[PDB]
Symmetry: D2
Subunit: 296 residues, 4 copies
Amino acid sequence: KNIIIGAMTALITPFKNGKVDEQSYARLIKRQIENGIDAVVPVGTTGESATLTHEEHRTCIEIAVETCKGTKVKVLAGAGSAATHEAVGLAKFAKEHGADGILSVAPYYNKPTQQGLYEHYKAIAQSVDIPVLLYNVPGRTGCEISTDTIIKLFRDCENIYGVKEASGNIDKCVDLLAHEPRMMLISGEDAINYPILSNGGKGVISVTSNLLPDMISALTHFALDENYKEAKKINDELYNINKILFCESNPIPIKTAMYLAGLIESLEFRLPLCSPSKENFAKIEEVMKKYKIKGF
Amino acid sequence: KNIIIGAMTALITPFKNGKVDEQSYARLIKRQIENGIDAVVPVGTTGESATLTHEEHRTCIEIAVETCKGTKVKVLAGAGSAATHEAVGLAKFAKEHGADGILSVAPYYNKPTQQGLYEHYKAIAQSVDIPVLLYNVPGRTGCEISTDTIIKLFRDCENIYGVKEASGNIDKCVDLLAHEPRMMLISGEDAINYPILSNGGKGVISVTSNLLPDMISALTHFALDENYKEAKKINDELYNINKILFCESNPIPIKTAMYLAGLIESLEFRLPLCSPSKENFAKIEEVMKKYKIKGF
Amino acid sequence: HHHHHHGSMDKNIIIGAMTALITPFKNGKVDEQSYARLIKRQIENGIDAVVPVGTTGESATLTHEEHRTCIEIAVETCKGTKVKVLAGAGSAATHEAVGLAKFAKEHGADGILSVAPYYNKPTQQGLYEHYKAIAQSVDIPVLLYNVPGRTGCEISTDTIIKLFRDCENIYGVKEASGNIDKCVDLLAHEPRMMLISGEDAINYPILSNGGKGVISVTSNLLPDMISALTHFALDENYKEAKKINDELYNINKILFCESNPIPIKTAMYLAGLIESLEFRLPLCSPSKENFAKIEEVMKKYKIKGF
Amino acid sequence: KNIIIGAMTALITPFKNGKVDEQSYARLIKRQIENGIDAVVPVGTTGESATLTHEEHRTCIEIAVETCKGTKVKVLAGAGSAATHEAVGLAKFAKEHGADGILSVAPYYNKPTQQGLYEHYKAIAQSVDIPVLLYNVPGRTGCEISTDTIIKLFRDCENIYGVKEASGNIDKCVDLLAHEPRMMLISGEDAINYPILSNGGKGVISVTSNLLPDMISALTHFALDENYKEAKKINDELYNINKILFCESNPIPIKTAMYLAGLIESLEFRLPLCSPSKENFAKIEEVMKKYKIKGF
Ligand SMILES: NCCCC[C@@](N)(CC[C@](N)(CCCCN)C(=O)O)C(=O)O
Ligand SMILES: NCCCC[C@@](N)(CC[C@](N)(CCCCN)C(=O)O)C(=O)O
Ligand SMILES: [Mg+2]
Ligand SMILES: [Mg+2]
Ligand SMILES: [Mg+2]
Ligand SMILES: [Mg+2]
Ligand SMILES: [Mg+2]
Ligand SMILES: [Mg+2]
């Protein structure tokens, strides 16, 4: 299978006057490239995919593709939906805009059965000829892609090559790679990046890497090179910031931190997201001081 | 406050060859009207709101509004979204096209904070002058509207008049009505319709009533009259069908039951929803045989 | 031989308003005089039964001798009254639970409460055999007790109903499970059983669905209010029962701001009803902030003295 | 600190005609010693601690102490209780009868607060001069020793040197060793032995090792030697048996497997534990066929 692995960043989407700040978006991607990141994920959960329009979805994918052009850095475009017809359309558009592959979150809200998830992802994978990474995050979607369903999809669909797990379930991570060691298991939970990689996971799709791309990329590369002691050292050092970045729903903390670090102009969200509480604003700022934040 | 209470049905959306079957949709609503139902909810969760287009959403609301004219039956239009801008747009459409009120599910997938939920619903409520019922279903959305947030919205926004709860949490139901007895608590979980009503809830938004509208209407009206012996008797008798209608994710079982009773022409869903397993198909049929199902 | 048709055969029951008694300590010993005085106060404020050495009575840290002494005081104090003694007798070990059941029978308890085995997580078959052994060891009523947040296991509706139908003296269940759906499930499929509320905040919803009593924490502090709530409900005066349930919500919830019985003993101490705020380790006093919160919530209520 | 780490077995307690089979118990321990195990845990959860008398509990500890004489194998005696006075008494017995350390499960059923847990373990630790390992298993006890409480106990009490985690929470495993790298984190969940060891855990207290002691010992020793690839290979191979040994509550499956293997004479439990279902008995037998089970 063709794959997209390594250290990847779920890009925030900066807003300016209620609009996507396209100059800031490109500038933030160049900063990721300069700090060792292997791929960027425009318009995932961290990029506020649910509140962007389709036009804005396209704009972000195009900026990511153009900015990464000529670098080794790939674009794994967010393209999931609760509706299969919409997810198929987003997959086809992402392929046409030049994306290297697609990330596709399990349908949220409508709780498809395992048979329904299989048909959903089979339809998506059949619509394109680029790699497709499944994305399991049951705390947000209300459903779980089972290990059996993930493995069946990997085996039955040429394009489907692994899964981004955001499920707090290292047992499932063992289950997946013990029964199907050819798949690419990707960490979707920064605090446990190292345990997922040390069990044979092959990358991360990170929130923390927005702020500390050098540290998350180094963690990932240490682990892929089997230097577990050094990968664990960075994972341990990052625990405090990894946890505070979820003191409110992601991406409220990471955007707050990027604004405090001077990396975006304006702490703007799209409703129903909004600024953190005064107390959590202070906690994020405090945890940040313990880390060296790369500039532009 | 202007309110919409009583026995209400979360309408299924029939499909025929991939499109909304508009003749069947109207016929099903007339059947609800003729069996004692007080309001109908087009394009809620049970109506596959997440997989309908904007145009189909609007078509279903218009059919409901037209079919309920000249009757006492109200239209409480589904209008929720994960994006506040889209929820406001749907609210405004429902108002301008004659809906009596709106139902608005808590944003799914993006997990807004309580402050974000407050701002989300304040924007929706300020956009229309018709009643707004909140809708909490954490198992599907990934978030909870807290009791404090529900009560503040009810007290701060003239047209927010209560909440549809689908949370399995009778403690919260007591909390809500003990601290704000003027709100309209609406049961969103059929199996516990009677306990919610007997604590002072004032209606149901029912899945089971698609199949058995006369029974749910009678349960509700006995309860509103404090004829609790009779209301509990029906609630007890309905437990088996109330539970089997969730043997797979709603609306897979209820649409299956409607098809099995000849009330819709085709067992068609929009992906990622799909037909139930053959085993559950048979289980639903066997439970149906214990109930008296009205025709057209 | 055994059989599956006990459901409509005569079952002695213990229902109504019941109190899960705190166990007061003085210098680390059971304060036996205070214990009797607190029970008399329950009797005089309309309570129908008392539960010595349940969860609220710190059953896990009493010695077997102290457990037996508390049952004896409860039995002696309730003689000559309408008030029944439903003795705590559960255990993670079936052999211990049988021994406690037999003691309660031989020392004059009216019935036993028997919590689902904690920590060892028996299967539903194991729970069935556990309670079959207990029920067949005595001839007094047995109330099952489901509290999965504490035990790590659940007695399923099907197992509860099987036990009710298969054993003469098992007559119902005390539910502390935050699960009104299960409460409907139970009484819809087996309306002959006695469902007893084990969670004060939802006493009225359980009673209004046909539950027939409560085993209360709040009634340690406010026995007249819990008794009135229950008797109104049993008479189908649901307006008055709900009014009391709503008024009690604040205290009902603050009594669990830390693990029960830490808040209720704190409230009883603040009310002057016990001499010292003494627990047995690993239980201990609440945080200073929760101490203050409990004190504040109490102010809205009229607390009966002795 | 003095410590007890490495590959350890939570010993089953065999019964014959309702009594502890003392000869089988000693024979089973010798089998563990001869298959690479570093310590044995008499009368833990797997040993049916809840249904043994205090006399039987003490007998099992004495047999373990006697059988390990003349070997490097340590006895980490089960000594926990919901009552602090009982836990202190069991700790003092274990010390005075030659145990090398104690395992002490968090109080079950009565849900102490973190302050209560601290006072509980402080009292236990001060009662003896041998190592004390905390044991967190919230699914069984109804409470959780927080990371902060574990770390305070480790720092404040000379004897307390780590924690056995059976919590399905690799995030907390990271939390513990990131903030207090000097403690000994011990895996209490066989399926994730390798992830816990690869994060710097220093041992296991295993159920599976009752049946497959050579494989669990080899896994643990490869990990401790930083041969993570070979440790992961065994962890992956063992996943199927690791999971089937929990198809019913432990120790129902492990005793079933030991009986099927001819390692214990009769499939006897103490109520409320009992035989598995016919169906799960067959599932256990089938999974066993893929593994080489050492004899005596
Ligand atoms: N990635 C950019 C598009 C975001 C679109 C949408 N806001 C709504 C998508 C929708 N399928 C719209 C249904 C409209 C009829 N009710 C949904 O709400 O699930 C979402 O996916 O959350
Ligand atoms: N109700 C008064 C007696 C309390 C006894 C005990 N503390 C311990 C009971 C025991 N079966 C003892 C096991 C002894 C060997 N470890 C238990 O801990 O489960 C409990 O049940 O929690
Ligand atoms: Mg690279
Ligand atoms: Mg809605
Ligand atoms: Mg008497
Ligand atoms: Mg039945
Ligand atoms: Mg009367
Ligand atoms: Mg509570």
